């Protein structure tokens, strides 16, 4: 099946930033024709740890910016919602509506996304066990969602640390397509992440077997207004994608049937 690569800057710092990253993602989409690229960027970081951290420029501005990326590059779009009322307006541009990890159990939010007719990707909560995502999928199907994804992004392991239990991939695959979040899984919650572990863990993900990967990427991560310690330098995206496609190919014959 066509492998999914969800990538883009963590936050919509500006429409300019989006177009710059979008241009590169479009270039890669022309090279890796076996991959379905989906451009991602949040119009609002509604759960920052600090009240002083960057959040965004609003839903209106964000949707407009994402619409520009789609119009200029013909790329599919995904962004996350935080409250039920945002589902409808976001659905006007987003091909995939993303549900934040902390909100994976909020029934009304899931239902709001599901009734839009768009695909829905739920980030698995850091508090959730793999088998408990079955009910998350059930809620979505109940709400009308026909294309559902579950994203592995790490599990609470002691304080300010996340561990990736790769057994979650084959478990969740039982009821939905599975995406591996390569950048959030190495973040150290409330720590201030370890970028040195992004590549090795993404290699593990495709060796185990998943339906796609999620990666935050920015031209200059150190200057990012969010996830500055974990966003992947844009220039490194192509090489990482080539590597995972190669590993996926050689491991694919061994992927177990669900």
């Amino acid at each position: 099946e066509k492998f999914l690569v969800i990538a883009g800057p963590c936050a919509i710092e500006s429409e300019e930033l989006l177009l710059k990253v979008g241009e590169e993602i479009k270039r890669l989409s022309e090279k890796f024709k076996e991959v379905e690229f989906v451009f991602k960027s949040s119009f609002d970081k509604a759960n920052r740890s600090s009240i002083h951290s960057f959040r965004g420029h609003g839903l209106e501005y964000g949707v407009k910016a994402l619409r520009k990326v789609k119009e200029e590059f013909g790329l599919k779009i995904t962004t996350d919602i935080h409250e039920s009322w945002q589902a409808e307006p976001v659905a006007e541009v987003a091909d995939i509506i993303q549900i934040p990890a902390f909100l994976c159990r909020q029934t009304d939010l899931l239902l709001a996304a599901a009734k839009t007719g768009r695909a829905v990707n739920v980030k698995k909560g850091q508090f959730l066990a793999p088998w408990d995502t079955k009910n998350v999928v059930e809620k979505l199907k109940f709400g009308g969602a026909k294309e559902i994804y579950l994203t592995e992004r790490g599990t609470t392991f002691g304080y300010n640390n996340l561990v990736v239990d790769f057994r979650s991939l084959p478990i969740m695959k039982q009821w939905a397509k599975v995406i591996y979040d390569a950048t959030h899984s190495v973040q150290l919650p409330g720590g201030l992440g370890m970028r040195e572990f992004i590549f090795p863990l993404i290699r593990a993900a495709v060796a185990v077997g998943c339906d796609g990967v999620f990666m935050e990427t920015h031209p200059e991560p150190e200057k990012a207004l969010s996830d500055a310690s974990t966003q992947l330098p844009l220039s490194q995206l192509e090489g990482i994608i080539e590597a995972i496609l190669e590993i996926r190919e050689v491991a694919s014959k061994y992927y177990e049937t669900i």
Copy 2:
């Protein structure tokens, strides 16, 4: 004064709230040194299953809670799940409760703070004790002056929560601390036998209040049936923690 937040998990009916409200009113008159706050949720917005009980809506809930306050003169507290709910809930709620999964949702915290009411945030199962400092800062920036942080367990492997009592003294540095005796022993996706033992630990360590879900017939409760405390056992547990607190308070560490 020591706070005791109690009531049925969900507003299954105003009748249920009245029955429980009558008992909490009685204890309220018996333990004058304790500040009682009646609690019940108008909506269980985060149930695991789509087929589980959620409630009768916000309007019916605020109505029933209004009835408890008017008929018994008890303070009220209930939780909100989206920003728009803050204002209407504040009409009756003396303390607005923020769900554990939603303790990092900035707009929900700000919305609650804006009402002028007290705010009690359930510490997320994913949050470290020291990371609650930023939660308090959001509420203060939002205008809140009476702020509570509630210990309700931390993710410990799958489908299990552990109470790290070191959290009580840590969180006390920036807010009043409440110990949730019923959700702390629940097994996500619990054991009532551990409720009393751990609540005794909480007061021995030192906290500003305790939170307990109580129901006349927990077995029939439409929510948290395995952990809600039988109404008839509430008085005994309250007297027990007051006695333990009386002796232990001598040793509570300064701030």
Copy 3:
């Protein structure tokens, strides 16, 4: 029942150190007649993280020193063993043979301690679940142990951190007397512990209900050759004991029947 207080310097730095601490423990034993005091000190720290850390002066020297404490103060003695051959020689002086947390599953060590006729106290491994101590007790009873204790000393919680799940107290009480280790439960494994949490957690232990407490104490912890960050200053011992006896008394009527 008579509450147990197991206390003493972590390691047998010298026979002098033992006598100094022993004198204070003897004084307290005369005051707190409702408490059964047991003097503790390790003749060898056989599991230090670093090869460069202090271990001890040998079994022979240690046993001799402990024998001096018992002879001079009439105090019961306890120390830990690391290999089966040490059980017999240690049993000559130790009233209670202690089994290290990492070795709580080593069948031969438990059996070696059990056949001596002495009481045996097993530190619950940081990897062990409360209900899995039932088999530990079974092994001991099988080996002839008639007086058995299980000691709560924390559980692995992420990296370099331990958490005390107080539910373990009533669970383990089902099959053995339970001791709460107040100083090791706050240590941060391979961290370099937080002494500020020793007192609050010990208060929790007696409120929940246990059969005794274990505390490492040293005249000048900062100068200790082991557990310098967690050993309780000797001058603070009396006050801590008074406090837990007071809390135990008021909470005792509520202790659940196993």
Copy 4:
């Protein structure tokens, strides 16, 4: 060359070792680029129950292992549990294995190092990856020159282990790293369905070898019956990880 440590969990009989040894010898001839090491324990010294199978003793075990080496020319490895066992086990064991629960026992490590043999330490379920540096230092101080560290899972709540693959690159800084594919999925006090998936992850991340318990009829094994790999499936898994390693190795990070 890549290391593959395999064999039945316990020496249930020299006959069993011979049957498994014959297959490992065959694969040894098929995969010349791989260094095979035959493994089996002469004693399961840490069983949960006093009534569980331990083995036939050290003498019978070393005897059977000697038979495997002599009859097949395969390297040998078995674990020790007390210091005195190091010398006699070293008579046949090319690699002395240190149990996970015993990875911090200084005298056991030194005893193993003194024999002059290679030493493979199972990382304790309680140990952080970076804390294995001190384990290596003990062995070096003891005279060991060939040192391995084996990833076998970390305590994750109760009766569960999680494999934090970040450990592979971290431990590689100071020793050769082996991934234990069978114990990493066992549930303390497991699921065979996760063995292959995680071993694929291990080679994709990068390691120096893999450890696998294999038995002709795992269902009848007297130890780790729920996780031992059926002998007939070993060849396929080895070929699979060699292919994945061949492609993935291009991306292994430098030291």
